[PDB]
Structures are given as structure tokens and as C-alpha cells.
TrEMBL record, chain A:
It comes from Banna virus (BAV). This is VP8. It comes from the Viruses.
UniProtKB/TrEMBL annotation, chain B:
The lineage of its organism: Viruses, Riboviria, Orthornavirae, Duplornaviricota, Resentoviricetes. It comes from the Viruses. This is Vp2. It comes from Banna virus (BAV). The chain holds residues 303 to 352 of 955 of the full protein. Transmembrane segments: none annotated.
Length: 50, 50
């Protein structure tokens, strides 16, 4: 018999066990909100002249 | 804020129809405002020598 397996499914390495508490999740969410404001502020500064 | 041409742009809270009517009348009157050198070039041929 022959066995064929999808390439990306083989041997998934373990993931980290840190930064998974409630406080760390807020930090990721806070970073996402402030990063999106960086892009919008850059566009707003372009549409204005300041 | 100022633009490239030197004009200053005002961004304010106003009505839609008040904005549309005011800005359209601004465009129509601006067609007759021309530079002094352009006006002279139009009336050079009519100027006598005396």
C-alpha cells in the first residue's frame, strides 16, 4: 500500500505558552487599535497640510 | 489649511444645500476674475498713441 499526505500537515511544531492571559490579550487588541490609527492619521495628515 | 496655490481651505460644519449653492456661485464669479496682465493683453489693440 501507498500513503500520501498533504505537505503542510506534517509535524506541526509546538506553539508558545506565554502571553495568553487576559492582560496579554488586551495588549494585542490595544496594539491593533493604535496601529490602525497610525494608518488613518497618516492619511489624514496627507489630506490636510499638517 | 493652505493649499499649493496659496489659497486657504476652511473645513466647517454646514448644510448641504447652503454648501452647494455657495460653492457654485463662487465658481461662476471666479470666471470673471483675471490677472491684470491678462486684462491688459486683451485691451492692447484698442489703445491709441496720443
Amino acid at each position: 500500500a501507498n500513503r500520501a499526505t498533504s505537505a503542510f500537515l506534517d509535524n506541526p511544531h509546538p506553539v508558545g505558552v506565554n502571553y495568553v492571559d487576559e492582560g496579554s490579550r488586551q495588549f494585542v487588541a490595544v496594539a491593533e487599535l493604535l496601529a490602525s490609527k497610525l494608518i488613518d492619521s497618516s492619511r489624514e495628515s496627507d489630506e490636510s497640510n499638517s | 489649511y493652505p493649499d499649493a496655490d496659496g489659497n486657504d481651505v476652511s473645513i466647517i460644519f454646514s448644510g448641504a444645500m447652503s454648501h452647494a449653492i455657495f460653492t457654485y456661485a463662487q465658481s461662476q464669479w471666479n470666471k470673471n476674475i483675471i490677472k491684470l496682465d491678462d486684462y491688459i493683453r486683451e485691451i492692447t489693440l484698442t489703445v491709441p498713441k496720443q
